[PDB]
Amino acid sequence: QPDSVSIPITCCFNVINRKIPIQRLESYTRITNIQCPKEAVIFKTQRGKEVCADPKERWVRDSMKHLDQIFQN
Amino acid sequence: QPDSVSIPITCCFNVINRKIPIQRLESYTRITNIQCPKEAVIFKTQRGKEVCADPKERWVRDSMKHLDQIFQNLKP
Structure with missing residues (x-):
């Protein structure tokens, strides 16, 4: 192969089954691979943890738009 | 977990369908989560690449043991 x-x-x-306030979020990446059961977003929190969220939810999409304007090297 | x-x-x-040369390997992780299709091993190479391998294969078990004995499977 x-x-x-x-x-x-x-x-x-x-x-995740509820909204995460955006002040606790630092960045995100998108999951789109066909081996996965669904498209998703992984948020990285300010405490450095990873949490899955559904981009079909408005709070997730609104959070991604804000996070697109910040970065951490 | x-x-x-x-x-x-x-x-x-x-x-992967063949061994990864041991000199290129840095560490590994065992994959056992019930959500995954099968138990697996992910090797990390010195150039940071990650490669899935079958833990039933002798080269995989031997490579894990080598990384355990030389590096304690850790690269701080």
């Missing part, structure tokens, strides 16, 4: 298919894939198997 | 299923979970959906 092509070696690219043996790269590990991160997925969100559940998503 | 992670405390919540709302934390992302990394899985291996396919495994």
Whole structure:
């Protein structure tokens, strides 16, 4: 098989069931890989933890738009 | 294991078809989460690449043991 298919894939198997205030969020990445059960967003919190969220939710999309304007090297 | 299923979970959906030379390997992680399709091992190379491998294969078990004995499977 092509070696690219043996790269590990991160997925969100559940998503958080309530809004996270944006002050606690630092950045996000998107999950779109077809091996995963659904498209999702991984937020990284200010405390450095990762939490899955559903981009079908308005609070998630609104949070991503704000986070697009900040970064941390 | 992670405390919540709302934390992302990394899985291996396919495994590499040949050994990765041991001199290139830095560390590994065992994948055992019930959400993944099968138990697997992810090797990390010195150039930071991550590669899924089948833990039933002798080269995989031997490589884990080598990384355990020389580096305690850690690169701080």
